[PDB]
């Protein structure tokens, strides 16, 4: 499987939700088992996910994912420590809306690290400690974390997670950074933490593509810059996105752009041999790229297995039938998964 022809490479990995990782499903057990030799769970270890709004942690579905990988001695990724997005309010705010203190908020953050990471030192090989920290203006995000705390809210997360398990692979990971604008804004944050001694050994690009931009050329700008800052290079979140684009829209269509309507979701009765071939040199193009910098990557991991399960059938329209990966909706491979498999097995 992919594993294999790429094991010279890179680790070949996949996010896994908690049904697949629970282990009831022995078609997807044989297949993983197969295909990839990482893992990352695709919900579980969010902080919203993990705990509810009262603080309170609920370990059944962090702990399959975690017995999963052990049972199958699969690499594991941690996803995520500290994020913007599936957080509680409370985390962040007192009832009336207002903040709490920098302090109040470093406690929480000191409290949930040293337990999250805590819980699995040693058993997850790395973390993405901190996700999405800049913005798409290119200035640093303004989540609640950022306004309560400053750039520390990046550096203390690092920190902490390194006194809690010293011997994890330290991950900053982003959308959209394979681009000329974010990238440079990425490269200087990272940068300038690192002066100030912030522990970090890789960088995460999150490859969410689309079928057709972002070029080949920009990626591979990318590769090579988050190289330099001597941090591995892994893709954490691959998939390619098939579907009518709404990210490019006249101003009119601004809010409606999220509406689902039929013309926007075009293949609810299959994906025509012509897109297939489509999405197949698509991923080729860009495992042809990872080959020629594998000294730089760490990693591929797609994100999700199937296209049954990808998140892109609900985002950013609700309900559509997007084919985004490598397997489709009955786990059989999709051209794409052979154009790969050649890359490797024709290798000179
Ligand atoms: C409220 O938060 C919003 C974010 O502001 C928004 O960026 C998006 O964040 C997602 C993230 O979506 C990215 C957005 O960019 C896409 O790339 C575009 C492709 O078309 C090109 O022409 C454009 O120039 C590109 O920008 C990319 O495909 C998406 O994946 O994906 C990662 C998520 O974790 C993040 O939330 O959406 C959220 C939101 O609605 O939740
Ligand atoms: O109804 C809830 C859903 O809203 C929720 O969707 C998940 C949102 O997060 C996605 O993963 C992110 C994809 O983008 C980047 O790569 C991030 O780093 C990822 O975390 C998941 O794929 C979706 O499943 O799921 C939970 C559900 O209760
Ligand atoms: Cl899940
Ligand atoms: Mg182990």
């Given amino acids: 499987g992919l594993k294999s022809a790429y094991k010279d490479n890179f680790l070949i990995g996949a996010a896994l939700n908690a049904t697949i990782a629970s282990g009831a499903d022995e078609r997807l057990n044989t297949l993983i088992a197969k295909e990839f030799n990482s893992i ?16 309170q942690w609920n370990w059944k579905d962090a702990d399959a994912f975690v017995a999963f990988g052990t049972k199958h001695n699969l690499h594991m990724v941690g996803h995520t420590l500290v994020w913007h997005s599936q957080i509680h309010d409370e985390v962040f705010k007192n009832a009336d809306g207002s903040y709490i203190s920098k302090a109040a908020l470093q406690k929480k953050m000191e409290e949930h690290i040293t337990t999250l990471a805590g819980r699995y030192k040693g058993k997850l090989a790395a973390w993405d400690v901190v996700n999405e920290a800049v913005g798409d203006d290119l200035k640093m995000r303004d989540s609640h974390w950022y306004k309560i705390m400053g750039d520390d809210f990046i550096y203390n997360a690092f920190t ?28 200087e944050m990272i940068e300038r933490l690192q002066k100030r001694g912030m522990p970090i050994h890789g960088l995460g ?38 579907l009518p684009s709404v990210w490019e829209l ?16 075009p293949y609810t009765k299959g994906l025509p041999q012509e897109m297939q071939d489509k999405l197949a040199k698509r991923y080729e193009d ?26 892109l059938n609900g985002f950013p329209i609700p309900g559509r039938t997007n084919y985004p990966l490598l397997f489709d909706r009955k786990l059989q491979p999709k051209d794409a998964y052979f154009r790969l498999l050649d890359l490797k097995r024709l290798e000179h």
Wanted: charged share 30%; proline share 5%.
């Fill in 40 to 55: 990352t769970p695709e919900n579980c270890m969010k902080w919203g996910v993990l705990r509810d709004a009262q603080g």
């Fill in 160 to 187: 902490l997670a390194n006194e809690v398990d010293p011997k994890a692979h330290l991950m900053y990971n982003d959308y959209n950074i394979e681009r000329t604008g974010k990238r440079e804004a990425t490269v």
């Fill in 205 to 242: 690009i999150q490859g969410h593509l689309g079928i057709d931009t972002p070029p080949i050329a920009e990626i591979e700008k990318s590769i090579i810059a988050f190289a330099k800052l001597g941090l591995r290079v892994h893709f954490t979140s691959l998939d390619v996105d098939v």
């Fill in 250 to 265: 006249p101003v009119a269509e601004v809010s409606t752009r999220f509406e689902y309507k039929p013309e926007r979701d």
């Fill in 286 to 311: 860009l495992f042809k790229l990872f080959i020629k910098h594998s000294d730089k990557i760490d990693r591929a991991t797609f994100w999700g297995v199937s296209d049954d399960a990808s998140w």
